[PDB]
Amino acid sequence: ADDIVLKAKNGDVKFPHKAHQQAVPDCKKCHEKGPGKIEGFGKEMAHGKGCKGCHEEMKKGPTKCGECHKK
Ligand code: HEC
Ligand code: HEC
Ligand code: HEC
Ligand SMILES: C[C@H](CCC(=O)O)[C@H]1CC[C@H]2[C@@H]3CC[C@@H]4C[C@H](O)CC[C@]4(C)[C@H]3C[C@H](O)[C@]12C
Known part of the structure; x- marks a missing residue:
């Protein structure tokens, strides 16, 4: 199956399953x-x-706005 992107208005949020x-x-x-x-x-x-x-x-993974959200 494929990764999914959450369509947040401020910028797409990728969710990579493998990681x-x-x-x-x-x-x-x-x-x-x-x-x-x-x-x-x-x-x-x-x-x-x-x-x-x-x-x-x-204690790992993105915690800043622009690390999750990216147009
Ligand atoms: C939340 C952070 C998750 C953790 C931790 C694990 N999984 Fe997951 N899984 C999650 C989502 C949101 C999805 C669907 C979207 C996607 O990106 O794939 C899945 C999907 C799976 C699948 C199907 C993958 C495929 O067919 O390519 C499997 C087999 C699966 N998840 C199993 C799995 C196992 C065994 C995990 C622990 C080691 C595990 N997941 C962690 C969300 C999350
Ligand atoms: C624990 C229960 C988690 C949940 C729920 C979500 N994430 Fe996560 N994520 C988690 C860890 C421990 C890590 C570090 C993995 C690594 O090897 O660096 C991550 C990482 C990410 C990443 C970056 C992956 C990379 O290749 O560096 C992203 C983009 C990310 N996580 C996004 C994300 C989103 C959008 C979630 C909710 C939908 C989410 N994560 C849940 C642990 C956990
Ligand atoms: C990943 C760990 C995130 C971080 C860090 C931040 N945001 Fe986020 N945000 C994330 C997701 C997966 C979603 C979607 C929820 C869903 O319904 O699927 C959002 C949502 C938002 C929204 C609302 C978007 C909408 O409703 O369309 C906003 C306005 C937003 N996020 C902004 C934002 C800011 C300013 C952040 C830093 C302070 C921030 N987000 C962090 C995931 C993650
Ligand atoms: C349930 C877990 C863990 C968070 C919690 O304990 O509530 C959370 C972590 C990431 C969440 C998924 C993120 C992508 C999807 C967002 C959709 O809008 C609803 C379905 C999905 C597939 C969500 C389902 C579920 O809500 C998950 C898997």
């Missing part, structure tokens, strides 16, 4: 989550534990 599969061997951080997680994602989650928050906790 995540390699750096986050605890797959249950994202997979086998209960129902509602597809509907639930948005800016709040993304800037929280959905994206940015995990990068901060694990």
Whole structure:
């Protein structure tokens, strides 16, 4: 399957899966989550534990606006 881009108005956000599969061997951080997680994602989650928050906790991955968002 392919990577996906989240179409944030301020600039596309790429989500590269391979880097995540390699750096986050605890797959249950994202997979086998209960129902509602597809509907639930948005800016709040993304800037929280959905994206940015995990990068901060694990001490790796982009945490600056222009590192995630790029036109
Ligand atoms: C969130 C940060 C994730 C972590 C950690 C892991 N995966 Fe993942 N996976 C995630 C998304 C958003 C998607 C779909 C979008 C995409 O970029 O592919 C996936 C997809 C998979 C797939 C399908 C991949 C393919 O067919 O090319 C598999 C098999 C998969 N995920 C498994 C997997 C495993 C085993 C992980 C731990 C080592 C793992 N993922 C981490 C989100 C996230
Ligand atoms: C943990 C549960 C994570 C979640 C949820 C998300 N990311 Fe992540 N990401 C995580 C780690 C530990 C790393 C470092 C990987 C490395 O080897 O550098 C990353 C990395 C990225 C990257 C850069 C990948 C690279 O090749 O350097 C990007 C662009 C990125 N992450 C984006 C991203 C987005 C958009 C997420 C939410 C949709 C997201 N990540 C979630 C850990 C975790
Ligand atoms: C990755 C770890 C991110 C960082 C660092 C920042 N943002 Fe972000 N943002 C990210 C994603 C994956 C999304 C999309 C959420 C979704 O619905 O899929 C967003 C969203 C925004 C938005 C809203 C865009 C829209 O609703 O169309 C804005 C205005 C925004 N982001 C701005 C922004 C700024 C200023 C940041 C630095 C302070 C920043 N983001 C960090 C992922 C990530
Ligand atoms: C559920 C995990 C981990 C965050 C959490 O604990 O809530 C998060 C991390 C990244 C999230 C995905 C990012 C890309 C997609 C955004 C869409 O708008 C909704 C479906 C997807 C596929 C999201 C589904 C789910 O919301 C994920 C996999």
